[PDB]
Design a protein around this ligand. Structure first.
Ligand SMILES: c1ccc(CCCc2ccccn2)nc1
Length: 129
């Protein structure tokens, strides 16, 4: 599924991401835009051999099991393929763990480089939320 921007903002809000660990909704939307282009089916291989999965590009090195990342953990107790669903529930629950892990949203490379320090509210401007 390729989410519309406001469509995704509403889904994330519904699952309790707006202001989770202090991160306003726009941070999550901006993250998703640059990580996945709002595509639940996005996958991208990392240099280390791990892969990032789904709307928030959750990494098989630590968070999900894809069966081909040696030495990795599966801290969300989920197959990585469950992160590609049209339903974002699994990606959201997993993201809540990630963001609680010590570095906040800096865990998302693209958030730090493209969203952090920007007017992230713009990402939810015009949405009925
Ligand atoms: C690996 C390559 C590309 C991507 C696309 C999204 C932006 C990004 C870049 C780097 C790390 C994490 N996110 N994801 C993983």
């Amino acid at each position: 599924k390729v989410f519309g921007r406001c469509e995704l903002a509403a889904a994330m809000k519904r699952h309790g991401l707006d202001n989770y660990r202090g991160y306003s909704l726009g941070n999550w939307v901006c993250a998703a835009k640059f990580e996945s282009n709002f595509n639940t089916q996005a996958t991208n291989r990392n240099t280390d051999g791990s892969t990032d999965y789904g709307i928030l590009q959750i990494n098989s090195r630590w968070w999900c099991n894809d069966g081909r990342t040696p030495g990795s953990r599966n801290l969300c107790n989920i197959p990585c393929s469950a992160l590609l669903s049209s339903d974002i529930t699994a990606s959201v629950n997993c993201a809540k763990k990630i963001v609680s892990d010590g570095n906040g949203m800096n865990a998302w490379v693209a958030w730090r480089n493209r969203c952090k320090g920007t007017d992230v509210q713009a990402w939810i401007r015009g949405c009925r939320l």
